[PDB]
Amino acid sequence: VEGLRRARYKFPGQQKIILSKKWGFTNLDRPEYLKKREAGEVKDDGAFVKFLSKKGSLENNIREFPEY
Amino acid sequence: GKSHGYRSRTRYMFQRDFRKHGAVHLSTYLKVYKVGDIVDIKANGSIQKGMPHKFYQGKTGVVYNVTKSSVGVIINKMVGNRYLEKRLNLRVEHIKHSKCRQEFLERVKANAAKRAEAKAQGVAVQLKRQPAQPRESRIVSTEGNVPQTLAPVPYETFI
Amino acid sequence: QNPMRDLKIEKLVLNISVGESGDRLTRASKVLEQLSGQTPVQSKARYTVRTFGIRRNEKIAVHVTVRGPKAEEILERGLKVKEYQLRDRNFSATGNFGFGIDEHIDLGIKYDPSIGIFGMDFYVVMNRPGARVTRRKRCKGTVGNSHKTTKEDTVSWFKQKYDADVLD
Amino acid sequence: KSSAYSSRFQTPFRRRREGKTDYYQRKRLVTQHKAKYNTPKYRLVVRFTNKDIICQIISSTITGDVVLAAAYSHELPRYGITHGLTNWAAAYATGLLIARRTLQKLGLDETYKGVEEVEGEYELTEAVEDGPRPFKVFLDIGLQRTTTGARVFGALKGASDGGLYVPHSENRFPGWDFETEEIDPELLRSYIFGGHVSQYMEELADDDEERFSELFKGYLADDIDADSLEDIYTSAHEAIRADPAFKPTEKKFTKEQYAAESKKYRQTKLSKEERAARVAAKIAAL
RNA sequence: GGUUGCGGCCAUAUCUACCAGAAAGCACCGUUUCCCGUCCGAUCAACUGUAGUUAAGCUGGUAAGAGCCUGACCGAGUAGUGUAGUGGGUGACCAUACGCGAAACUCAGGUGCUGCAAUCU
RNA sequence: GAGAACAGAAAUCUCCAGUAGAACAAAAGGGUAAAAGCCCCCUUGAUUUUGAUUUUCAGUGUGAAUACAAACCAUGAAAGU
RNA sequence: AAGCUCGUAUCAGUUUUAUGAGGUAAAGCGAAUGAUUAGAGGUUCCGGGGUCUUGACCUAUUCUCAAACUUUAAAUAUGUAAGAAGUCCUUGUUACUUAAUUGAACGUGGACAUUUGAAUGAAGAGCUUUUAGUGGGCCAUUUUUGGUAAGC
Ligand SMILES: [Mg+2]
Ligand SMILES: [Mg+2]
Ligand SMILES: [Mg+2]
Ligand SMILES: [Mg+2]
Ligand SMILES: [Mg+2]
Ligand SMILES: [Mg+2]
């Protein structure tokens, strides 16, 4: 927060510092991300993750997320 | 300098629809047009012959002449402070029948049927259209429909 | 279940790629006249390349296509040079195969010092009965997967007859 | 195939995907002069499948094409022709049959009697003075390639000789040599009555008995020699002009009986409830 | 209901991978004297329906399929926008009043219909 | 992409995939796949007579373009163009 | 300015109903084209160092954009129609057209009056001749181009 506050002096206009309720850089709320992870619906690929959908072929959705 | 060619500014107007390129379906050539029919003009980009000028795109006219592969259409054009009569020779690919009266001819048929039907029983056959009227009185019951109270919500960011 | 889906020879193409045109090509075109009994056709260069020494539309190469029982006869005499031995390569993923030779005198023709020595390219096209569906003008279609020609099918077919082997 | 490729793909017309209709020639075949209004243009459709010939008179409508008359090659047995239902001579006979059938239907069979003395001469059906002009159709060959001696033009000759006015030239008839711009009537007449087949039978008999036994098997079984096919074609032409009406084959069973038998050999779709069961069951196994 | 000829709308019809198909039809398939066309009867032409086969084409079914189509108080009355004030604000811009009103997203369902003629357990 | 003596990143030959990512004298934008692209065959309608119509517009001219009528021709089996 | 022909008559800087046309605002980039951040999993007899890395493409994702990009797509503006020059029944003309009294166009005679075909308004509508001045403009709200900006 202090690091972002010091960066405002380099910018014209007004900026606001907002504490996001999402988990990291994902578009999901913290309770939603925790629920998906415990159900084995989240797979790591690099710095981001991939989710499991109810659509598509079972042949592809079984080899991925074997825990689910 | 400026450019004012015949097909100027028609980059998107004369394009084909998405995934609708290619040959013209045969029902376009099987339709029959007669003098006095009301048609509307929409140019087809794949037929470069008998193509209307861009001004007449989306205009509606009356057929006055019939030829081998084309018809003659009359268009009223406003020039200055008065309208002038314009005559166009267009191939059938660029026109179609206007539905602005096909739903009016049926009302003409309906009026005659209703006028004759009530002739033997009741006067004041009432064959004039009316605009939407204000709603009449009604009773609304709360049986199984008890009103639910709503209040404004507080401000949140959720970003 | 193989009632009618037996592998068959479609055609055989004899290609001689000559760098230049003129007298050299005419002598090369003479070899194919009696080797196959048919008049060959010359192909022109698509675009010029300075390094290879050809120009656009120069009529550099020549080829001929043979079908019927005559195609097998030329293939058998052409396999005598290779001693009925091919590599694990030379077979395409579509079920076709081919090989090259350096001399045409060993096929049986005389030296004929008025002709010369030329190499030849052999390529054999394989298919099954019913391939007309992809060649007919009307109701053109595509061959089903089970009816397709496979690399493993051609090598097995090449082993049962000619009692040949395949290298590594 | 990537999803982007499939999304932006434009499928052609169904008849073009199946490779049955050429829409380039179809537009020019069916489009009528707009000052003639609802005057229909009639196509003489001639098609050649394996061991069958089909001839039809077809006009176009918004809802779909409408058949005016039809003539099938397999109807020739009731006119004396049993062998070679697809050769050049068969095409001429079914071309004559469709021509005489439509003239009777329109009530114009009395006029325009065609030609009763066929000799392989090129001529059109001229109109009669102070009377009705001949019925006019245009030849539709579909995807058939135009070559001189093809069977499609043989069916054209029969329609023209049957009283129908079909505009055509004689440069695609057998016997036309490209070096001299004239037709050879004597060779053209032979193809009318199977002259090419007769020459083959007599030559093949004295060259190879094995193939002459393999081919022309029906000729030997029914005792028709190489000089009998010419006269049966001649008798068939007179039989066509006598009773050109259409007679349908008697149906052994009713359409309802046919429908019931075909239902047992058709696989039915699955509704959503059991479709969900199949995937759910696969989850419990995998 | 199956099939063939000619179509209409032109993916609910396409694409990928598999399975199935009685009868008829279609098809593959056999031959090179003749008309005809090729380097090659492969394509095109002719002849036979005879010697063979449903292997493919073709048709239908299957897939928490891809695509496509339809609907939804799904998102959203959100973005945008017509009109109004001696409204807010240094400004950038924004709120309110009388009206109109998206797209993406999300979810659910669907996977050709049909006209003329002929023919078939 | 997978293959074939010399032969290689690029010579010629074969198959498969390929909605146009090519080509269509030129600037750019439209348009086009049994074609409007490529190759082959035959041709001169790039012809004759005089009007009507569209664009710029004063509803003048000039340029260009559109649909017919009356002739004579080209091409194709033909519808047609 | 002079009038002229007529007078319930059609019209309207308007709405409504039915039916067309458009590619701007917005939106979109795990949709095409063109830009653009970051890793991850794969691919080579087909880049180069080193006995294993860095570049290349492949596949599934991720961040951010377009006056001369786009599937989708408003609001405001915009074309036509809402009857007597209408509808229906019967049958006459022609050198056009049709295989054909088939059709096309124009007519004879018959049937249906102004709740006769939505709303509101209408110092009445239609028409002609002739001639003056003018042909340097400027300002405000909103949209908008060049320019740091300007009472530009
Ligand atoms: Mg032109
Ligand atoms: Mg053609
Ligand atoms: Mg004010
Ligand atoms: Mg624009
Ligand atoms: Mg924008
Ligand atoms: Mg002045």
Numbering used by the authors:
A (entry chain LN): 149 to 216
B (entry chain QT): 2 to 160
C (entry chain LO): 6 to 173
D (entry chain LI): 8 to 293
Give the published text:
Mouse RPL39 and RPL39L both integrate into yeast 60S subunits when expressed in the rpl39Δ background. Mouse RPL39, adopted a structure that was highly similar to that of RPL39 (RMSD = 0.482 Å) in the WT yeast ribosomes. While mouse and yeast RPL39 occupy virtually identical positions in the ribosome exit tunnel, RPL39L was found in two distinct conformations, one very similar and the other distinct from RPL39. The comparison of rpl39Δ-MmRPL39 and rpl39Δ-MmRPL39L maps shows that the amino acids S2 in RPL39 and A2 in RPL39L are found at the same position, deeply embedded in rRNA 1490–1493, where they serve a structural role. The loop containing R28 and R36, exposed to the lumen of the NPET, exhibits weaker cryo-EM density than the remainder of the protein in the map of rpl39Δ-MmRPL39. We replicated these phenotypes in two distinct yeast RPL39 KO clones and further showed that they are rescued by the introduction of yRPL39 (rpl39Δ-ScRPL39 clones), mouse RPL39 (rpl39Δ-MmRPL39 clones) and mouse RPL39L (rpl39Δ-MmRPL39L clones). This indicates that both mRPL39 and mRPL39L occupy the place of yRPL39 in the NPET and have a similar capacity to ensure the translation accuracy and promote co-translational folding in yeast.
